[PDB]
Amino acid sequence: VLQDVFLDWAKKYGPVVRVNVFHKTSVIVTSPESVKKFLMSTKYNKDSKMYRALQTVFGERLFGQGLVSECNYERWHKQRRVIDLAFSRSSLVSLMETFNEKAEQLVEILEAKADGQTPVSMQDMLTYTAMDILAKAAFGMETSMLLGAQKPLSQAVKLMLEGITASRNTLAKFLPGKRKQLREVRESIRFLRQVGRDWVQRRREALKRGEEVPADILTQILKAEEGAQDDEGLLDNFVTFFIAGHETSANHLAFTVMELSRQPEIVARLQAEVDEVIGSKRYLDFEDLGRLQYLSQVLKESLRLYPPAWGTFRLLEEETLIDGVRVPGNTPLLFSTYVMGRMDTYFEDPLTFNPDRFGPGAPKPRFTYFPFSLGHRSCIGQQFAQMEVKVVMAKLLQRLEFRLVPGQRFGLQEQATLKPLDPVLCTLRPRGW
Ligand code: HEM
Ligand SMILES: CC(C)CCC[C@@H](C)[C@H]1CC[C@H]2[C@@H]3CC=C4C[C@@H](OS(=O)(=O)O)CC[C@]4(C)[C@H]3CC[C@]12C
């Protein structure tokens, strides 16, 4: 686990460490003051030379110049301003029905298997859940993965994210069947962009027949592409949203369930809170979410130890002194919430999963914790995701208990994002016996 090697190095060699595992020499920077300086100013922008790995994968255009991978400030800001409209408080409030719907479908599907005996991959079920939410919420589409459909589509995502991590030259070293990987990954990326054309087409047709579709992310990514010569920019945003809008939430759900399977005390307390704030309501209202304070803590603590988005890069344009170390200009700086969250200098007993760290009255972590990143390039979807995941967790806590199958490991793996090494295979029982 490469991130653990970074952690080791940050601990042993200081807040600024030169690394060589990527195609360009980079430096990992782990003091909270440098985080503040570089992430909190629009003077510092993403390094396009690192972001090319998302832009294009094995030669095949993927994220392109969409909202995540465009690094130029002006070009980024023009699109960010348009797309922000799909994330207003009212927009998000109007997604509650979709969150509630898909979370309820997941729960019923799990309860149907809850005989303490049938193994279910919670990683897969949570990815199906997150994908059906995103497709419906952002694009008006029903993927129905919870109901067994669109398997090829989640496959294609897995292949291409594997591809991104595999592209690392120091890792993309010397094995034989790198040829098959290339074709499968290229083919997956083309598949996904074609899905995109189909879905955009659907929307365009609806509009031509005079339907009034409520404005969603799709509306705004179309709006951001008005004067375009072709649809490539549009499809870059489709891919951006499709992936960024479900993969990280699915990873974060899967980590949280995996970790809770060994935290019976925390679980009991989550269950009490659920019963208390939502009782036996079937659906959550938006006001309910704010009261799931303890669940909120658990989710936060889950992101400290297990941040799916584990790093971000900024271009250091000119030679500069950083925590005492001279860093050459034109150097990619890596900031890692994964690393900092596991340093005992920033967190006491860092490997202990302790939700009280985010308890009320506790001081907020100060530039040592950023699972949605910070500053102008922080996650546009943070509130959407925090809503989404509390809805899913609250529903599960209300109705089900999980036992991890013996032999399942607690480890992580990097496939672009971090996610559980194992599929979080569980057996399930209805809550209470
Ligand atoms: C728990 C889930 C999520 C986590 C941990 C997460 C994390 C973050 C982080 C750390 C970045 C990267 C910034 C970089 O390259 O350094 C990112 C940006 C972004 N995320 Fe999220 N994200 C999540 C959910 C979502 C959701 C639900 C959506 C969309 C509905 C979304 C959309 C995006 C987009 C479009 C960007 C690029 C924003 C910009 O640069 O203006 N994310 N996110
Ligand atoms: C887009 C959404 C899902 C958020 C993604 C957030 C993380 C997971 C992204 C942001 C920055 C991304 C990388 C950029 C650049 C690289 C270099 C590349 O190796 S290299 O040989 O091409 O230098 C390996 C993948 C890696 C580390 C990335 C993994 C994935 C990465 C950390």
For the chain, the structural domain boundaries read 1-433
Q: Scanning the structure block, which residue is given the tokens 């860092």?
A: 350
Whole-number Å distance between alpha carbons of 418 and 6:
14
CB 410 within 8 A of CB 244: no
Q: How far apart are CA 307 and CA 301, in angstroms?
A: 10
Nearest CA to 125 out of 272, 274, 282, 253 is that of 253
Task: Tell me the C-alpha distance between 427 and 347, whole Å.
Answer: 33
Amino acid at 283: Y
Structural class in CATH, domain 1-433:
mainly alpha
* Separation between Cα atoms, residue 386 and residue 249, nearest integer Å: 9
Task: Give the contacts of 305 (CB within 8 A, at least 6 positions apart).
Answer: 255, 259, 341, 342, 351, 353
Is the Cβ–Cβ distance between 365 and 79 less than 8 Å?
no
Cβ–Cβ < 8 Å for 18, 10 = no
Q: How far apart are the CA of 297 and the centre of ligand 1, in A?
A: 20
Query: Resolution reached, in Å?
Result: 1.9
Structure tokens at 101: 């719907």
The Å distance, Cα 125 to ligand 1 centre, comes to: 21
Residue 71 annotated as lining a ligand binding site: no
Indicate left, alpha or beta for 122 from its phi (over 0: left) and psi (-120 to 50: alpha). Answer: alpha
Residues 202 and 124: their CA atoms lie apart, in Å, by: 28
**Residue 373 Ramachandran class (φ > 0 left, ψ -120 to 50 alpha, else beta):** left
Q: Atom 23 of ligand 1 has which residue's CA nearest to it?
A: 248
What kind of experiment solved this structure? Answer: X-ray
- The 3-state secondary structure of 71-129 reads CCHHHHHHHHHHHHHHHCHHHHHCCHHHHHHHHHHHHHHHHCCCCCCCCEEHHHHHHHH
**Given CA atoms 60, 61, 62, 68 in this order, what sign does their dihedral have?**
positive
Residue 424: Cβ within 10 Å count: 28
Which atom of ligand 2 is found nearest the CA of 169? Answer: 21
Which atom of ligand 2 is nearest the CA belonging to 63?
1
Q: Helix axis angle, 293-305 relative to 382-399, nearest 10°?
A: 110
Ligand nearest to the CA of 46: 1
Alpha carbon nearest to ligand 1 atom 29, residue:
245
Look at residue 27 and give its three-state secondary structure.
Answer: strand
Nearest listed ligand to the Cα of residue 314: 1
Q: Which helix (H) or strand (E) holds 44?
A: none
- Tokens standing for residue 207: 């509009």
Q: What is the Cα 89 distance to its own chain's centre?
A: 21
State which ligand 1 atom lies nearest to the alpha carbon of 377.
40
Residue entry with tokens 């939700």 = 355
